[PDB]
Design a protein around this nucleic acid. Structure first.
Ligand SMILES: [Mg+2]
Ligand SMILES: [Zn+2]
Ligand SMILES: [Zn+2]
Length: 395
DNA sequence: GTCGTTCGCTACAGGCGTCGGTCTGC
DNA sequence: GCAGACCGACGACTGTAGCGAACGAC
């Protein structure tokens, strides 16, 4: 079967995350969005595991079901050097064993969803490998809490340890990361990093796997690419929409080139804020090869359908109008990705003509994109002539 | 024209580095 | 004067009350 799975979210026990991020609400919104598989997130927190065991039914020792949505155990943890890592756990026993292993190195393993571990990246990855726990750098190019803001290579961070994937990130796609030859031997995950069950948050990115069943072991085979299983698609935000795509100030969000930031010594001259290097500049800084791996699954660039509806209707992202139109589209067609990429523009027009024209302009690269940077999300705008013209005249 | 309903924007919440400024024993 | 210890604030890890003000079915 072919399923869509988002393997990096955060519960309400994490920080700066909506209190609505509980198993029932997450499952409801994932089902509404057409999301087959969702990572649990924060699995090292015992209270979140208790809530899981409460609101779920067992599929196997590492797969659970809430309101028809499947869940495998995942967690993001922070390094001794302030570097985030994503981990996928085979069974609940691996979760509990890892949790007990790091209690002597952590002070918030029981009170937080994103724990801090007084362990280096190599130590964490080695402990995971010893327990067959899938480990990988999460949002690997963020200028604040990623691997590549701390290290110049995966080898410098993990040493003799092994990773099982690399989480791309909102502000990057597969080609950018594949500009580093090492990455060619590593599977990519495109996950949402959702702090909210909102439509444009939960499942903003995901991975499309081919599996026999929806279980942890099938997903592990799909990530490894063995036994006929495979990651056949990586759906993700257009890298320009991420918060850290370009190099900009952390306070006023004004964008600067890499040369300009170097000459300015990383302080914004118009607000005194700290300029943070974008992932595009960072990857070009670490650029290695012009080749790509052949086995690399295609990356489908997305823009959240709620954002399209908000820019068309000229209203806010949380408005009731965009919510109603988004629900109409989802009831009618079943998934955001289908409306964005797969559905014919004529069928989109039956629900809303302006949204159909905007989606056409998105598919045909005729949409204005103000790239994000320094912590500000990218903005999406549509030229006026697109909305003024008729559908049959676009092409 | 009324008055519930809805919108959009600002302020603010909360448990380990970085980054300026300050104090301290020479 | 000054190196170096000491210190406090600041923001990522972003979401949402909540408050004027505009809207929209009667
Ligand atoms: Mg992306
Ligand atoms: Zn993280
Ligand atoms: Zn600035």
């Amino acid at each position: 079967m072919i399923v869509d799975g988002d393997l990096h979210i955060h519960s309400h026990y994490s920080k700066a995350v909506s209190k609505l991020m509980t198993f029932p609400i997450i499952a409801e919104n994932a089902k509404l969005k057409g999301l087959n598989l969702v990572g649990t997130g924060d699995s090292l927190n015992p209270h979140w595991e208790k809530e899981l065991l409460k609101h779920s039914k067992p599929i196997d020792d590492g797969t659970f079901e809430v309101n028809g949505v499947k869940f495998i155990l995942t967690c993001e943890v922070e390094d001794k050097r302030r570097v985030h890592h994503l981990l996928i756990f085979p069974t609940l026993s691996q979760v509990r064993e890892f949790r007990e292993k790091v209690k002597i190195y952590s002070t918030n393993i029981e009170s937080e969803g994103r724990p801090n571990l007084n362990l280096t990246a190599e130590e964490i990855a080695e402990m995971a490998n010893e327990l067959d726990i899938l480990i990988g750098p999460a949002h690997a190019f963020t200028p604040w809490t990623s691997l590549y803001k701390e290290y110049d290579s995966l080898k410098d961070a993990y040493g003799d340890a092994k990773i099982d994937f690399l989480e791309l990130g909102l502000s990057a796609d597969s080609d950018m990361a594949d500009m580093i030859k090492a990455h060619h031997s590593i599977p990519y995950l495109s996950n949402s990093n959702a702090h909210s069950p909102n439509p444009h948050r939960l499942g903003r990115e995901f991975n499309r796997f081919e599996v026999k069943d929806v279980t942890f072991e099938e997903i592990r085979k799909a990530i490894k690419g063995v036994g006929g299983r495979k990651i056949m698609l990586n759906a993700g935000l257009d890298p320009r929409l991420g918060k850290y795509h370009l190099t900009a100030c952390s306070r006023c969000y004004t964008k600067y080139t890499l040369q300009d930031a170097v000459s300015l010594s990383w302080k914004c001259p118009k607000c005194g804020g700290i300029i943070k290097k974008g992932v595009r500049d960072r990857i070009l800084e670490l650029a290695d090869t012009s080749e790509k791996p052949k086995d690399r699954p295609p990356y489908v660039r997305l823009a959240p359908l709620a954002e399209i509806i908000a820019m068309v209707l000229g209203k806010g992202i949380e408005s009731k109008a965009v919510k109603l139109l988004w629900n109409r589209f989802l009831r009618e067609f079943g998934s955001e990705i289908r409306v964005l990429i797969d559905l014919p523009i004529e069928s989109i027009a039956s629900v809303h003509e302006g949204v159909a024209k905007a989606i056409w302009a998105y598919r045909n690269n005729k949409l204005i994109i103000v790239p994000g940077g320094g912590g500000k999300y990218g903005e999406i705008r549509i030229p006026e002539e697109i909305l003024k013209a008729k559908i049959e005249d676009l092409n």
